[PDB]
Design a protein around this nucleic acid. Structure first.
Lengths: 48, 271
RNA sequence: GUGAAAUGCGCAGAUACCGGGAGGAACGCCGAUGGCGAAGGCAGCCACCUGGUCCACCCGUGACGCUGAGGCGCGAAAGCGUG
RNA sequence: AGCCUACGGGCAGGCGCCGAGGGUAGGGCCCGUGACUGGGGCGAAGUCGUAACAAGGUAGCUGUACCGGAAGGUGCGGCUGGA
RNA sequence: CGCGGGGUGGAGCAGCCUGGUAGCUCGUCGGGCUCAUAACCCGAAGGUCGUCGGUUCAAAUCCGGCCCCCGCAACCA
RNA sequence: AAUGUAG
RNA sequence: GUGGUUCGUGGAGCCAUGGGGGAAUCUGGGCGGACCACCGCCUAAGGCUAAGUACUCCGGGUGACCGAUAGCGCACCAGUA
RNA sequence: CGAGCUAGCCCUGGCCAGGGUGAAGCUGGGGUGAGACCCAGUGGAGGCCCGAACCGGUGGGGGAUGCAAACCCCUCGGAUG
RNA sequence: CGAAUGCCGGCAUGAGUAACGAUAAAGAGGGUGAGAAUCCCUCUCGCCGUAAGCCCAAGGGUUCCUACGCAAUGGUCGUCAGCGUAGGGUUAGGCGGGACCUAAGGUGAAGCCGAAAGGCGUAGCCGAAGGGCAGCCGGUUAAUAUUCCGGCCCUUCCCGCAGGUGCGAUGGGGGGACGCUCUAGGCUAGGGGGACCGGAGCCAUGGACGAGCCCGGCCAGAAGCGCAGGGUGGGAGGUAGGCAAAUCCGCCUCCCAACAAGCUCUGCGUGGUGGGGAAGCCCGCAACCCCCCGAAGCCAGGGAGCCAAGAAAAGCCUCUAAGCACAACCUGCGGGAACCCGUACCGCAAACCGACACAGGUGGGCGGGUGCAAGAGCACUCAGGCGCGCGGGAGAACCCUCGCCAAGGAACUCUGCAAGUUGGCCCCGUAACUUCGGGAGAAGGGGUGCUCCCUGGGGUGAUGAGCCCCGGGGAGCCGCAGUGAACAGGCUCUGGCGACUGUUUACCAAAAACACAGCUCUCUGCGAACUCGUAAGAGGAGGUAUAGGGAGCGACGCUUGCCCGGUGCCGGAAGGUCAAGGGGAGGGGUGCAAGCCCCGAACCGAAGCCCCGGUGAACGGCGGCCGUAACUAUAACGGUCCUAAGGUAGCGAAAUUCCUUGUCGGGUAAGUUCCGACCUGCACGAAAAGCGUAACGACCGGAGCGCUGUCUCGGCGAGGGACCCGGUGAAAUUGAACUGGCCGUGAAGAUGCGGCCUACCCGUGGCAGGACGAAAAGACCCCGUGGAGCUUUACUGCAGC
RNA sequence: UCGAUGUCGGCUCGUCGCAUCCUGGGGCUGAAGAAGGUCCCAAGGGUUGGGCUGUUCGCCCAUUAAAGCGGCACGCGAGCU
């Protein structure tokens, strides 16, 4: 039966993207936080 | 005339449809002026703000003329009566001598081939449009502006009319389809006659789909919800409001007047 | 308003009077112990469509008539359905 | 396969069609009867009123409609078998 | 059982929170009106205030006790 | 401004 | 009508101001805790000003600080798997 | 931070084996003063019927540290809206 | 540190136990290698075949191919692998996306709004599975191919040439361009037959040298031809319009032309050419034609009907503007130029989502053949692909899934739960009741195979011959049985509820719940009311009273009484009260005073509320005690007290009745249920509707008939487990244990105290009485000045008005 | 006993008590016989099939020698319902 997760790359990029964080203030801070944490990945990476 | 059906199915027993004598000999609408795609959309910036709207046949919009004083003095022939999905009345496509074409909300009596015209000059007969001053006190008349040059606001529901009741300076007394009595400015245009397709009131929808075809979603009663949901909501098994009937929002809905008290629209109204 | 009353309306300005407007129903006098219609029934004025009837002229058809089970239509008021 | 034979045939026997009726199922008409129920008829001296007959004390009857303990009332129209 | 209300002439009800006067309608009796009976008129009669105590100078009334009549409550399990 | 037992 | 001050409408000044009304130029004007009168303090409605003060990404010095279940989450390729 | 589950709406696409029933309208005849109507023949309507795909989840059994954090079997509802 | 259901770690117990993940199924002979049930090959056996086969999207991201490997992973094994190591592999102007278009929506010049962050928003830009658009068939690799190669064929830019023309947009117009259902005639895909053509071979086992048997009889293809379609009037003059700029569109006016031809555009066929090409022996002979059926695909923008009335923009045509006409377009033809990104492999799954090589979920297309009326259904089967990554034995109990059963037939049970019966098609034949469509598959019945004879239509041809397609009548044959297997309704009578098809508690409730067509009340006159929002803004609605918001009842039929005193809502230019404010009689504090500062009564002061009235499909309500008839009973009738007024019609022991299994009747041998009645209705009743109602229902009750392993009452059988062997090997739980019975005792329910009795040590297959057995710091209950959801005439506030 | 002692009835399986419903003894009798009544001794063995209700129980049908009453956590859900 259909589970929560249904990978779709368009979705993922439009939603958790670098460009998508940066437009909102709230998102800008996400990035700020993760940089400052040292995360190797600021964004959910996605590609083909 | 209202077609009634034989009961080869329940529901198709109560259902009745329109005659289409009305309109005949013209269905595909006028690619030219007629169409802008119409935007289905049952609310504003996110949130639904009219409950129970949605679904229903995809629909194209006919762009009608509600300000006829552009074409003063130019007559036009009535070229066809056609179907409009977007309102209760039918519409007439008329070719102006001008070349130019437009759709008028088709008044009663109006028939293909007639010539029709708008101005202070115009003959006092069907479909012609005129300032209210140059229209004889007593005639019925529809598609009435409310302020001059603002477009026709009154009397456009299928089978509606207003009646000229009296004069009074620059202003002119009007009995509205409601029963209200309102002064309207003399320069406010109006088209002689009433609206027609007046059987429209008598369609018997017939079943609950159809209601859906017209994009009307089911409407759930107040009590029928729970208290979070509604004032009437709640009560162990079935309930009697519990004083006094109210919208979801809470404000009273049996008898409470809502129009704004100090409106400058006042002084113009009298019923 | 009645038999006399009372309910009721009215100093928040009624009734009585005047002017301006809205709306619906019914048509005074003429009008009669009158007329028309098979009946039920039909009444202000105008125009249009249309039924029956009467008189006169002795012209035409030449018994082509009377009645009518059943059928078919009309049928006051009240009442019913939709608006 | 039998029995007869005047070898052709005959008889017995066997099969079929129909068939009294029996069976299964579904209908139609009539008769009897039923907790209860609706009025109807009748029954020397029961309760409540007084509708009708005298302008019967609201002329009366009438078709309908609504209402009412009951006669009955009231609306709409009609009749005179009232004036 | 658990709460609350009632008991007054023959019937239906006042009077009791605010002790000292038992009032009202119907009915009953006697007399009118009628040929007579209702209807109507005149004038009367009739109550131990369910009941035994307590308080008070004085109890239908305030305070308890028994006797009747009616009303609610009897839930979580 | 009601109603008047049977024969 | 409110805020700030220790001040919570208090006898409630002072400082600031959303609204209304609305001056004067030293006889000008604010203040000294309602308000009057003396006595005194100061010159609003323009602006700039180091230093002495805070903090520790970073460099260094110390420790009656820890010593790998401690010390930073991480002594180890960890903000990883 | 989430509507890559779920609920609604919007834009644009795709899907519904094959059976059955046979509305209206036509045509024809009959009918009448004209009509109404009745008859065949044609026609092909419907939140129509049976029933796959597809959607579902009625009843029973099974499973119950499961094949499964809702599954399997038989049975059952819708199936042009 | 010994306890915190403590925290991290390690190691026990259950235990060699349960399990090893679909009951589609295996067997043998050969290879290989240290080692083989598990790898390779062969042959037999079984399973899938609208697939479990083939191809595409998404997702995954090297899983692809080859060579080495076998520690770990693989539920066993492993020589194998999607595992480890290494090396290889993805080729495009035409496929798909981008240097084209717009949709919802996003963004956003201007513009607007917001304390900041930010919110809106016109043009424009972004945004696709929608529009537009140029490639087919073969051959090659170990692994890519419409991408490489071969053959044939196209498109766009730039340049030159020739010839044509008033050329020329960011502008105007046309077009692009549209729904559902039903369908015509042509094709094609695809399929069947052929006695015809081409083929290795074959005659077994009694017969067959046969019109035998087996295999195969194609595909792509420009121009031009055909054959079907689809689109389209052609003039000449006026010209108020297309934000006049037009020779174009639009609109008048009139010669011709016409259910045509023509001009034009697709499909299909044919076509120069190119390719393919079976069954067969150790890997190898070169037909390609005739008939039939035939699309849901093509011609396509085809036709008919119907209402609910069915995208946009570019490309493309055409019109004119500045301009420019030594430009510039248009049409040929030649030569040049032609980027970026993807292209392996999996892809209903062991490679995707489900922590797993998980019995679960996943969109699109192809999906052969025969038979059963049809079909994508059902049985077998082609191509192709699989036997589901632990086996080998036994032949208990018991469980699962299945088959059968004497006689009886619901006696089972809360309940026919479950299982049976019934089942397709053809033909007879079908009741009450009905809204009249229906109730109808009502019920009930008969037939069904095969051989031979005779016969009627239809399609294709051609009117004839075959090849299909529907039939009609007759004789006859075999079984227990002809829808011979598989798919495949049990029916009836009568209540309650809901009119109806529908919707819901994802994951215990599918219903009498919600929805619903329809009925009523109410608001709203348009910058509508109402909703979202601080605003700007937007929905409502590009609607306008026959329309929009709110509320209730919920098809239809027949109906919906009385009470406006209380509460709401509506109306009441008077009155009463009423805040700030106005007004200042009078009073006070200070100054020598001019003054400056306080209070402060009359009275003028909204809304609201008081007051007067209306209002029931507005919140709501709809009585008590006595007495009375010529038998008794009861009370048509009377008295009286209270209320705002005292329940009408119609229902009534009901989904509502406590007493209750009320009482009568029906039904049965027997009926606390059921059905029909009667009422003293504890406690029905009219739009939170009243009473009915055809039809509908996976809704709840009550009867029959049929039939049955439900039962009397159980028996036997099949398979998968359970048991034995070999391979791997968990779990909760666990203070420690050397863990018997009874009577007592004990915190009052003892293996563990007392007395007595009983008992050699240790396993295995079974059962579930006990260990107050396990799991979860009880849901019930109370407690806490614990929380949270909901309510209101609790309080106090706020939004709003 | 609330860091859980599943909580009616049914089925299945029983086992016990006697205050005995049958069956075996027996004494009184208002015991003629037959059949009762009543008490005494005695559970060894028995103690039915249905309709109605979830029912326990009860009433009813047809039988019977009889159609007993109790306890076992209102015995028995790690046995089922």
């Amino acid at each position: 039966m259909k589970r929560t997760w249904q990978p779709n790359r368009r979705k993922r990029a439009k939603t958790h993207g670098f460009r998508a964080r940066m437009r909102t203030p709230g998102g800008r801070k996400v990035l700020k936080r993760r940089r400052q944490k040292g995360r190797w990945r600021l964004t959910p990476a996605v590609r083909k | 005339a209202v077609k009634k059906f034989k009961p080869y199915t329940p529901s198709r027993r109560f259902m009745t449809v329109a005659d289409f004598s009305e309109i005949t000999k013209t269905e595909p609408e006028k690619s030219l002026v007629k169409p802008l795609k119409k935007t289905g959309g049952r609310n504003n910036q996110g949130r639904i703000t009219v409950r129970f709207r949605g679904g229903g046949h995809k629909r194209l919009y006919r762009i009608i003329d509600f300000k006829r004083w552009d074409k003063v003095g130019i007559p036009a022939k009535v070229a066809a009566i056609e179907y409009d999905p977007n309102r209760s009345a039918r519409i007439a496509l008329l070719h102006y001598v001008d070349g130019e074409k437009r759709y008028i909300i088709a008044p009663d009596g109006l028939q293909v081939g007639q010539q029709v015209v708008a101005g202070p000059d115009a003959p006092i007969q069907v479909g012609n449009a005129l300032p209210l001053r140059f229209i004889p006190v007593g005639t019925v008349v529809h598609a009435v502006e409310l302020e001059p040059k603002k477009g026709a606001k009154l009397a456009r529901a299928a089978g509606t009319s207003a009646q000229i009741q009296g004069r009074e300076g620059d202003y002119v007394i009007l009995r509205l389809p409601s029963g209200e009595l309102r002064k309207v400015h003399g320069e406010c245009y109006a088209t002689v006659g009433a609206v027609g397709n007046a059987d429209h009131k008598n369609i018997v929808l017939g079943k609950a789909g159809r209601s859906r075809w017209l994009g009307r979603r089911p409407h759930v009663r107040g009590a029928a919800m729970n208290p979070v949901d509604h004032p009437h909501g709640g009560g162990e098994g079935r309930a009697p409001r519990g004083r006094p009937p109210a919208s979801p929002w809470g404000w009273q809905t049996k008898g409470l007047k809502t129009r704004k008290r100090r409106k400058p629209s006042s002084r113009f109204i009298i019923a």
